[PDB]
Design an enzyme around this catalytic site. Structure first.
Site, mmCIF file in Angstrom:
data_model
loop_
_atom_site.group_PDB
_atom_site.id
_atom_site.type_symbol
_atom_site.label_atom_id
_atom_site.label_comp_id
_atom_site.label_asym_id
_atom_site.label_seq_id
_atom_site.Cartn_x
_atom_site.Cartn_y
_atom_site.Cartn_z
ATOM 1 N N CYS A 1 38.712 40.051 31.585
ATOM 2 C CA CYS A 1 38.379 38.704 32.023
ATOM 3 C C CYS A 1 36.907 38.560 31.579
ATOM 4 O O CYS A 1 36.381 39.508 30.976
ATOM 5 C CB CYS A 1 38.547 38.551 33.535
ATOM 6 S SG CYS A 1 37.504 39.657 34.518
ATOM 7 N N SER A 2 36.233 37.427 31.868
ATOM 8 C CA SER A 2 34.839 37.197 31.425
ATOM 9 C C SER A 2 33.921 38.447 31.461
ATOM 10 O O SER A 2 33.525 38.924 30.410
ATOM 11 C CB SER A 2 34.205 36.045 32.203
ATOM 12 O OG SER A 2 34.119 36.378 33.584
ATOM 13 N N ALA A 3 33.561 38.933 32.651
ATOM 14 C CA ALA A 3 32.697 40.098 32.836
ATOM 15 C C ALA A 3 33.463 41.423 32.933
ATOM 16 O O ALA A 3 32.835 42.490 32.940
ATOM 17 C CB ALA A 3 31.806 39.910 34.067
ATOM 18 N N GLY A 4 34.795 41.336 33.021
ATOM 19 C CA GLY A 4 35.688 42.486 33.174
ATOM 20 C C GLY A 4 35.610 43.178 34.524
ATOM 21 O O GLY A 4 35.760 44.409 34.601
ATOM 22 N N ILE A 5 35.346 42.392 35.610
ATOM 23 C CA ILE A 5 35.271 42.952 36.979
ATOM 24 C C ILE A 5 36.036 42.131 38.047
ATOM 25 O O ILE A 5 36.655 42.730 38.913
ATOM 26 C CB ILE A 5 33.794 43.236 37.442
ATOM 27 C CG1 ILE A 5 32.935 41.939 37.570
ATOM 28 C CG2 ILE A 5 33.118 44.283 36.531
ATOM 29 C CD1 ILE A 5 31.562 42.130 38.353
ATOM 30 N N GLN B 1 35.066 40.895 42.431
ATOM 31 C CA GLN B 1 33.702 40.403 42.575
ATOM 32 C C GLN B 1 33.490 39.483 43.767
ATOM 33 O O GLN B 1 32.392 39.465 44.300
ATOM 34 C CB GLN B 1 33.258 39.739 41.248
ATOM 35 C CG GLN B 1 31.735 39.469 41.150
ATOM 36 C CD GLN B 1 31.359 38.852 39.830
ATOM 37 O OE1 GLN B 1 32.216 38.521 38.991
ATOM 38 N NE2 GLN B 1 30.064 38.692 39.614
ATOM 39 N N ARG C 1 38.561 39.126 38.099
ATOM 40 C CA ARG C 1 39.998 38.969 37.908
ATOM 41 C C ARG C 1 40.594 40.297 37.476
ATOM 42 O O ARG C 1 41.693 40.631 37.920
ATOM 43 C CB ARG C 1 40.270 37.906 36.843
ATOM 44 C CG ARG C 1 39.427 36.669 37.056
ATOM 45 C CD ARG C 1 39.837 35.569 36.112
ATOM 46 N NE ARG C 1 39.029 34.381 36.372
ATOM 47 C CZ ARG C 1 39.026 33.298 35.611
ATOM 48 N NH1 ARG C 1 39.789 33.236 34.525
ATOM 49 N NH2 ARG C 1 38.279 32.259 35.938
ATOM 50 N N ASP D 1 41.592 28.586 40.734
ATOM 51 C CA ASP D 1 40.246 28.330 41.243
ATOM 52 C C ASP D 1 40.310 28.398 42.780
ATOM 53 O O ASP D 1 39.419 28.969 43.400
ATOM 54 C CB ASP D 1 39.726 26.962 40.746
ATOM 55 C CG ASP D 1 40.544 25.784 41.233
ATOM 56 O OD1 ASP D 1 41.672 25.588 40.718
ATOM 57 O OD2 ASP D 1 40.112 25.129 42.205
HETATM 58 O O1 LIG Z 1 36.752 33.628 38.085
HETATM 59 P P1 LIG Z 1 37.039 33.229 39.619
HETATM 60 O O2 LIG Z 1 35.877 33.811 40.594
HETATM 61 O O3 LIG Z 1 38.418 33.588 40.103
HETATM 62 C C1 LIG Z 1 36.661 31.460 39.741
HETATM 63 O O4 LIG Z 1 36.994 31.161 41.082
HETATM 64 C C2 LIG Z 1 37.418 30.543 38.851
HETATM 65 C C3 LIG Z 1 38.799 30.500 38.855
HETATM 66 C C4 LIG Z 1 39.451 29.621 38.014
HETATM 67 C C5 LIG Z 1 38.741 28.771 37.186
HETATM 68 C C6 LIG Z 1 39.398 27.839 36.292
HETATM 69 C C7 LIG Z 1 38.948 27.713 34.990
HETATM 70 C C8 LIG Z 1 39.522 26.810 34.122
HETATM 71 C C9 LIG Z 1 40.562 26.018 34.559
HETATM 72 C C10 LIG Z 1 41.034 26.131 35.847
HETATM 73 C C11 LIG Z 1 42.161 25.245 36.272
HETATM 74 O O5 LIG Z 1 41.655 24.347 37.250
HETATM 75 C C12 LIG Z 1 43.346 25.985 36.804
HETATM 76 C C13 LIG Z 1 44.086 26.766 35.935
HETATM 77 C C14 LIG Z 1 45.176 27.472 36.393
HETATM 78 C C15 LIG Z 1 45.516 27.386 37.726
HETATM 79 CL CL1 LIG Z 1 46.877 28.267 38.291
HETATM 80 C C16 LIG Z 1 44.791 26.609 38.605
HETATM 81 CL CL2 LIG Z 1 45.241 26.525 40.282
HETATM 82 C C17 LIG Z 1 43.700 25.908 38.141
HETATM 83 C C18 LIG Z 1 40.447 27.041 36.709
HETATM 84 C C19 LIG Z 1 37.361 28.824 37.201
HETATM 85 C C20 LIG Z 1 36.698 29.709 38.020
#
Ligand SMILES: O=P(O)(O)[C@H](O)c1ccc(-c2cccc([C@H](O)c3ccc(Cl)c(Cl)c3)c2)cc1
Length: 287
Positions: free
Chosen positions: A222-226, A266, A228, A187
């Site tokens: 990944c979710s939308a496929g764009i 994205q 990650r 995140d």
């Molecule tokens: O799709 P994105 O735009 O990248 C967007 O920022 C984004 C990126 C991750 C998450 C997300 C979702 C679920 C669980 C977690 C955990 O907190 C977690 C897991 C592994 C690790 Cl390694 C860490 Cl540090 C932290 C993070 C949500 C949204």
């Protein structure tokens, strides 16, 4: 140079290291890149809504994966939210970028795996996201979808990913499949979170090489496929660029991705993360 004017910023080691840590320059550069999103009206096919996780994240028509069986002339049967993605040096169909399957697209996803002879799937969804970001589209042991027996032969549990060794059988032909479920997507995309993604990229490109000449497309989702998905593929391309050319062009790579599928990488934080990953790899290669 086909759907928009491509941009380039060839980075040597020093500039790569510094660029990764300059968010002000990163954001100026990132937000100059067109998203190249598809107008939703391009897809007015009855029942299309049910095939899309996000109504505004659609496959660009020129590079769309069409499902040719059982009806190539039926716009709905042939539809999947997926695009062929060029790899390093513009090599055609190195990857397919697609949304995480939904309940109504699980069978369409396996139709795509069979049609394409896909040897590897890269899934970038954390465990606590398994609700609304990806449906569990693989079986516990075995399942059949459209005459194809899908068998999970082995689950290999590693720190950052779960590797499933899958068997695909239809009639007399049997195929192997490697399913990489990455569970360390951060995140907060700080430099200390870059090594698991880099490890995944290296492992997948080595497994891709082991498929031998003319590797079939590698499915990445990944979710939308764009978002990650874009990061994974851009990192994969830039690792080969760094090894071959001694430089990285994240900017030109992002442009090439966007030409194939609108919105690849994205966010600005994803863009910076790719720079953190590439800066890290450059330091590892330098030894
Ligand atoms: O799709 P994105 O735009 O990248 C967007 O920022 C984004 C990126 C991750 C998450 C997300 C979702 C679920 C669980 C977690 C955990 O907190 C977690 C897991 C592994 C690790 Cl390694 C860490 Cl540090 C932290 C993070 C949500 C949204």
């Amino acid at each position: 140079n086909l759907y928009f004017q491509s941009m380039s910023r060839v980075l040597q080691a020093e500039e790569l290291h510094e660029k990764a840590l300059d968010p002000f320059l990163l954001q100026a550069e990132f937000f100059e890149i067109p998203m190249n999103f598809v107008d939703p009206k391009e897809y007015d096919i009855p029942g299309l809504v049910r095939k899309n996780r996000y109504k505004t994240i659609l496959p660009n028509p020129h590079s769309r994966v069409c499902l040719t069986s059982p009806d190539p002339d039926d716009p709905l049967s042939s539809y999947i939210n997926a695009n062929y993605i060029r790899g390093y040096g513009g090599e055609e169909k190195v990857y397919i970028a697609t949304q995480g399957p939904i309940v109504s697209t699980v069978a369409d996803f396996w139709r795509m795996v069979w049609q394409e002879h896909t040897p590897i799937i890269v899934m970038i969804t954390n465990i606590e996201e398994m609700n609304e970001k990806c449906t569990e589209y693989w079986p516990e042991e075995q399942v059949a979808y459209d005459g194809v027996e899908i068998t999970v032969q082995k689950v290999i549990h590693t720190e950052d990913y779960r590797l499933r060794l899958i068997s695909l059988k239809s009639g007399t032909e049997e195929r192997g499949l490697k399913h990489y479920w990455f569970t360390s997507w951060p995140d907060q995309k700080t430099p200390d979170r870059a090594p698991p993604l880099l490890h995944l990229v290296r492992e997948v490109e080595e497994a891709a090489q082991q498929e031998g000449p003319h590797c079939a497309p590698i499915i990445v989702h990944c979710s939308a496929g764009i978002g990650r998905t874009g990061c994974f593929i851009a990192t994969s391309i830039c690792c080969q660029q760094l090894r071959q050319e001694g430089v990285v062009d994240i900017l030109k790579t992002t442009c090439q991705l966007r030409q194939d599928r609108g919105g690849m990488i994205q966010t600005c934080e994803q863009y910076q993360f790719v720079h953190h990953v590439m800066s890290l790899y450059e330091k590892q290669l330098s030894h």
